[PDB]
Amino acid sequence: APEWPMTGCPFDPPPGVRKLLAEKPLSRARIWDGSTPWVVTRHADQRALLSDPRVSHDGLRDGYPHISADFKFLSFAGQDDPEHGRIRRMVTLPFTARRIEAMRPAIQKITDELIDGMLAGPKPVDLVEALALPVPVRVICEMLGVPYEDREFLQQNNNAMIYRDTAQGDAQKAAIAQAMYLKELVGTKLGDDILSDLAVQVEAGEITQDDAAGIGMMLLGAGHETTANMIALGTLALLENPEQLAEVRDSDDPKVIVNTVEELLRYLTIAQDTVRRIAAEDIEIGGVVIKAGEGIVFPLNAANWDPDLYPEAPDRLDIHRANARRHLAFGYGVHQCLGATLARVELQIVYSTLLRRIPTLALAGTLDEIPFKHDQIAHGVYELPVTW
Ligand code: HEM
Numbered sequence: 207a208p209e210w211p212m213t214g215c216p217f218d219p220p221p222g223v224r225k226l227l228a229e230k231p232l233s234r235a236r237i238w239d240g241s242t243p244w245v246v247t248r249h250a251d252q253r254a255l256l257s258d259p260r261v262s263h264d265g266l267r268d269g270y271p272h273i274s275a276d277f278k279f280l281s282f283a284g285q286d287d288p289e290h291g292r293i294r295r296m297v298t299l300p301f302t303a304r305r306i307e308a309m310r311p312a313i314q315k316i317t318d319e320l321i322d323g324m325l326a327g328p329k330p331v332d333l334v335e336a337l338a339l340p341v342p343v344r345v346i347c348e349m350l351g352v353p354y355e356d357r358e359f360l361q362q363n364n365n366a367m368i369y370r371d372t373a374q375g376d377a378q379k380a381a382i383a384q385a386m387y388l389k390e391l392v393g394t395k396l397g398d399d400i401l402s403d404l405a406v407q408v409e410a411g412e413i414t415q416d417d418a419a420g421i422g423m424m425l426l427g428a429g430h431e432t433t434a435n436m437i438a439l440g441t442l443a444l445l446e447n448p449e450q451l452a453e454v455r456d457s458d459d460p461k462v463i464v465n466t467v468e469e470l471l472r473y474l475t476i477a478q479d480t481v482r483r484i485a486a487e488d489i490e491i492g493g494v495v496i497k498a499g500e501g502i503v504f505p506l507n508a509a510n511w512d513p514d515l516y517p518e519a520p521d522r523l524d525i526h527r528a529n530a531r532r533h534l535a536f537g538y539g540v541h542q543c544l545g546a547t548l549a550r551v552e553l554q555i556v557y558s559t560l561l562r563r564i565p566t567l568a569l570a571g572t573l574d575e576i577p578f579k580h581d582q583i584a585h586g587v588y589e590l591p592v593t594w
Pocket residue numbers: 282283284294346424425428429430432433436476477480481482535536537538540541542543544545546548549
């Protein structure tokens with residue numbers, strides 16, 4: 207059983223992963239804890255399994271293929287229905303299309319302010335620090351109903367939980383600080399925002415104040431690093447594909463920014479193999495039998511380069527790929543990304559505004575000088591020096 211997970215093509219999935227996808231759609235791999243879960247590479251099969259009620263997201267179950275030991279420790283996103291949906295229903299409305307369309311001015315203002323700071327400051331500048339990290343956490347603060355004046359505090363806490371050079375002890379203090387704060391804010395709300403909605407539930411007896419705070423925390427975590435990685439990696443992908451950058455920037459067709467975000471989501475699949483399940487019952491698929499209690503690993507980045515679905519050079523960026531929106535970058539089934547509409551719309555605004563306001567944007571060095579997050583689960587770059 208090969209080890210899992212398996213450099214000068216840094217955007218591309220690992221070579222062994224492309225090999226599996228091509229010749230062993232379903233196979234076993236040994237992960238960090240010595241278990242050998244199934245690896246499911248095909249887009250079709252990921253959809254099949256992820257929407258099969260025999261497939262469980264319950265990380266307390268023996269066999270569950272946790273991403274790493276730390277994720278194992280932590281152990282609504284890690285639960286099955288009915289409790290998963292009971293909780294998800296309480297935070298569904300603010301993420302719906304209409305409500306996210308209604309956030310466009312707020313996301314646009316956040317973006318323009320941060321581009322104002324870039325443009326007043328030195329160059330080159332790290333796009334990660336200047337834009338990619340601040341936007342998503344600021345947007346989520348606003349949906350939560352975090353007062354403007356506590357913004358920087360929540361941002362630094364959340365940043366601290368993301369940095370490689372934060373010592374775990376400090377990351378945990380930062381996490382403790384977020385929870386205490388959110389719990390306090392929920393007590394306060396007892397507004398229009400998520401925490402007010404959650405305060406209603408608290409007041410109704412449906413969840414505790416602690417639970418309210420945990421949900422808040424979870425939305426904070428979930429929506430931050432992922433979106434940041436997309437901002438930074440997505441920008442870099444555009445800068446490495448200049449003819450396509452120019453089009454996204456300069457096209458008069460509003461569909462192009464829309465397509466570009468989907469093709470970026472598909473091309474980069476930053477959530478990689480973070481999607482994990484366990485079979486609750488035996489499941490027969492693709493001529494093998496996944497047995498009850500066996501783990502299942504979903505390399506979304508394999509599915510999104512699947513030639514059954516993306517036959518025309520899926521290993522190249524093509525913003526006109528007519529098919530891109532079929533990607534599974536936000537996963538699939540009942541745990542499909544709650545923020546998927548928000549993310550789409552955040553990236554449309556960030557990429558378009560970044561390129562229209564900084565039409566001379568340029569990588570300050572070259573691709574090979576960029577430090578990628580090869581050593582992590584979520585794909586991305588530690589730093590992105592840009593100039594103009
Ligand atoms: C590029 C941006 C994003 C990507 C690639 C992404 C990816 C994903 C993926 C793959 C999952 C599925 C996890 C699983 O099945 O185990 C997921 C779930 C989730 N995402 Fe995102 N996400 C993004 C942005 C956001 C944002 C902006 C938010 C919230 C504000 C968010 C909140 C969530 C939540 C709450 C879940 C759990 C859904 C559930 O279990 O019912 N995400 N995301």
